[PDB]
RNA sequence: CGCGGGUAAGACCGCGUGGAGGCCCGAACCCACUUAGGUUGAAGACUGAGGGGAUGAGCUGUGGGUAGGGGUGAAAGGCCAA
RNA sequence: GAGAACCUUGCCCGCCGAAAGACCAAGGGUUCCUGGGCCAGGCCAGUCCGCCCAGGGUGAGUCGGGACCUAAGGCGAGGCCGACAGGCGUAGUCGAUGGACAACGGGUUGAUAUUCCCGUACCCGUGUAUGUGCGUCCAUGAUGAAUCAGCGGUACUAACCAUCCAAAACCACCGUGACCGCACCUUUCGGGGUGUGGCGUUGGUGGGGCUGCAUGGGACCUUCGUUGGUAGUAGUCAAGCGAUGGGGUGACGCAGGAAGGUAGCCGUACCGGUCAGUGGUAAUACCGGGGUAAGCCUGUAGGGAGUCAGAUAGGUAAAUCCGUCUGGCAUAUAUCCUGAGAGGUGAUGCAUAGCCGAGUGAGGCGAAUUCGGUGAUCCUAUGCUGCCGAGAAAAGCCUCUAGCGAGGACAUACACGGCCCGUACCCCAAACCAACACAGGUGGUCAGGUAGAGAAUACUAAGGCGUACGAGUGAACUAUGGUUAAGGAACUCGGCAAAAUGCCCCCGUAACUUCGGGAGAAGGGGGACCCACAUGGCGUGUAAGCCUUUACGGCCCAAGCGUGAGUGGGUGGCACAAACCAGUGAGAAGCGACUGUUUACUAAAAACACAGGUCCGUGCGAAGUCGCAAGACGAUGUAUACGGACUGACGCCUGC
RNA sequence: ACUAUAACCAUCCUAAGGUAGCGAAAUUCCUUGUCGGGUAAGUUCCGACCUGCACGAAUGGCGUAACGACUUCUCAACUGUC
């Protein structure tokens, strides 16, 4: 059998590829954060 | 020499290995070894620019001295001759009478304990280095520089040797390994002799895995690909591409040397193919 | 490599050490050839019996990289979050 | 308890036992413990619960991390490149999956423990006191290093010994740049071109000198080394720290034993106990114990290592350190380093088999603890020996000077400081990934016994479970096992599925062959138990004995323990590889040389790859490629190398 | 010298008109070609004949020991496949 699901959770990899300090790094990312603030999201980034 | 394996296994039937006869030591000099991590043919962008590269065995860089200008008149003795993974020919480790240790490519016929003097007044026995001005016309040299003071660039492989055809003005006309005749400034150094491991070309690896050790990876022909992947692709059955042969990026077969190059004026004549 | 034979030296042949191999049989491990069941299932791709490799072009953890007319591809239009 | 198959307690039965046991990492986040609840959830009911509520619980100088270090990689001061956006990248600074670094055994709560407590250690710093104990001034050593000159040639200078090559022109031969008549091919003949001719120069080839090219030296001023004085006079110089610098070490692959050990396991000396209502069995039989670490001593098996002196600028300065060259002395079981293990200590302690009352259970006492046999996938071992595919960096430790320096080093005793995060619980699962309390997935560490070659397989010890719908009932029928008379592929698209062979030891093995194979070919024989050979053989090894350079010695060895294989005789059954586990074999053809890869989820192949062959391109920030450009891979490679194309071992070949 | 065949010759044309080797082939429509082996009976299988619809020399030709969860046929043993 091979039941390996797509999502294998991990915390260092999550904050390293969807994290805040990555989001603010690039121009597009700062737009993502500024966008979700306008929508009112409680959790701006992952 | 070349040692041929006995047919104990199908992967080993026709195989043969380099009879490591000239090797004297099995460990490099610690201070002259620097790290070297494989890239896999992928440039700084991350993409793969040259295909069929990867895998391979981890190897470390032995600092080879192609800049023999510092030591002029300080003799050395060939301490050992050992095996280099990176390059095709062996390398000899020189113990300078000064006290400094250096690595050079091992020229043909070199033996441990021989003396190697480099300089303008050095002799013309194999291993010595002296600028092309002092080398008698017609001899056989290797590791020839290209610019006056830029390092050895021509004829560095195994069994490959340049023959200095003559001198004229401030230019020495060499016969390159490829058979092409090229002029080079007479201020640049060269090393006398051929290069070791003349029997490298006769090695028969014998199996697919052995070239995977050496760092190569499988190469897929064109006529098997699909029309997107390769211009030869497609066709129901077996085809020969249905077109004049091209590289996978569409460029047809033909001479690719960029015309009108600054270094063109030096080249006396280019190599001849098929004659 | 050693011993003996063999010879002028050889070639080569027998006996000892040595233990090479994309070598052999076979569990862990990795695959997925046949069959039967499942087929509003235990499971949105599995189970039971057999099966191939199993010191290598092996399998695996950790961290990282390549991004859409682009990547990657031992090449099937396959893979890039069912 | 109102209510019980499902909750609790006890006694039986059964299942896993390389796991369905024990400990982790990732992941989850209060699920952990105590008290309480039973409209929600649990595929039923539930007094129970991983559910709901309240309270409690996670203790570190030594463990996994940070405060120490780097790899792949990311970010990147300046910077370069780019209309703008932005792309790369140096200096650095991050980044463990790696390097370096100091703790072990026992006990305790309802929940934590290498964290608390008990006993014993280790590693960084601070202060005080005690001496030892060398110094700076003071003085010792401080005598002695620099200079004046000579010698004798490094040394631009002028030049010479002059030289490698032929710098440059000279000449000629050949060849022919144009051109000029003409010689030739000539077109069938003429033309016409070429220049086989004239030079000459598209030019090439050769010759010697002209001398040049660069090359040093001999060697001159200069510069310096040596020697001769000049003051054992001016410097120097001395405790101790000593780098951000130099240098060693850190520092490395795969395969394979052999050897020595230990952990574990199996008996026994010895100690404590049982009579398990059966035919026999009182100590003769049976059951249970037959333990204990880090550290500190000692340095065994094994492995490794030459030492001393002088000179020397190569190590961005200087070095007494590292190199390299000279000499001397060295083959010793000499010396030194490393180092499993045995032995002592730690340990008058701890703990345990059991014995007492006491009962949720608290508490008290507590015996013997020798010899062997077997034996590792663990330790010596980052070792040794082979092989080619040639096998990270930095901090750390040591050393060297540069440099700081008048105080500083060593030991003893005492008193102190040692930071931040994690720490409960599940962790091959009803607590993570799968929408579920899901037959799927999930990396690492422990490995008992008897058969066995084995981590397979069967049973089983410690431990853990009976896993959450049941109770019955010989229907058809479906699924999963089992058996079958006579026949044996007649079944069918096809021996699909089943059945059959199956292990160990002997005997014997064909065509073909690339001389390796084919081959476990095929085919044939034996296999249990008891006794005897046998107080034998073999391993081990104690007493005794021998020997020594006497010690953690070497050889040998009755007894003791363990153990095959064979021969002869005998007994039993239908059956002796008795269960489980465990090749079907042979003949021929096509395709593909082979081992491998492929359509995750209907196609594993005759497809792809493959070692081998050839062709084309590339003279070097190459050709090719990613980018508008810088830049990068190619490659820290150089035509015996690199990229592209087609064919696909090997043999005979590859026609027009 | 009877039949057929076509060695041989002639023609046109092209750049040249298929050499070796193999051949009812993973290519052959006719087609279950014909002859032989195997079976009581063989549209499949093996060996050859060549009349190659429409093989052929690196889109390689002919062979080939060993290897194959490849395709095809036969045999021994085995059996509820029958």
Curated annotation (Swiss-Prot), chain A:
Tell me the superkingdom of the source.
Bacteria
Q: Which PROSITE patterns does the UniProt entry name for this protein? A: RIBOSOMAL_L34
- Gene3D superfamilies xrefs: 1.10.287.3980
A GO cellular component annotation here is: ribonucleoprotein complex
Q: Which Pfam families match?
A: Ribosomal_L34 (PF00468)
Q: State any GO BP term from the record.
A: translation
Q: Which UniProt keywords apply?
A: Ribonucleoprotein, Ribosomal protein
The cross-references to InterPro entries, in alphabetical order and at most eight, read: Ribosomal_bL34, Ribosomal_bL34_CS
Keyword set includes Ribosomal protein: yes
Which Gene Ontology MF annotations are present?
structural constituent of ribosome
The UniProt entry's sequence similarity note says:
Belongs to the bacterial ribosomal protein bL34 family.
- What is the official name of this protein in its record? Large ribosomal subunit protein bL34
UniProt lineage:
Bacteria, Bacillati, Actinomycetota, Actinomycetes, Mycobacteriales
Give me the gene this protein comes from: rpmH
Swiss-Prot record, chain B:
Please indicate if the UniProt record lists Ribonucleoprotein as a keyword: yes
Q: Name one GO cellular component term.
A: large ribosomal subunit
Recorded hits in Gene3D superfamilies, A to Z, give:
2.30.30.30, Nucleic acid-binding proteins (2.40.50.140), Ribosomal protein L2, domain 3 (4.10.950.10)
Question: Which domain of life does this protein belong to?
Answer: Bacteria
Q: Name one GO biological process term.
A: cytoplasmic translation
What is the purpose of this protein? One of the primary rRNA binding proteins. Required for association of the 30S and 50S subunits to form the 70S ribosome, for tRNA binding and peptide bond formation. It has been suggested to have peptidyltransferase activity; this is somewhat controversial. Makes several contacts with the 16S rRNA in the 70S ribosome.
Quaternary structure annotation from Swiss-Prot or TrEMBL: Part of the 50S ribosomal subunit. Forms a bridge to the 30S subunit in the 70S ribosome.
Matching NCBIfam families = rplB_bact (TIGR01171)
Q: What is this protein called?
A: Large ribosomal subunit protein uL2
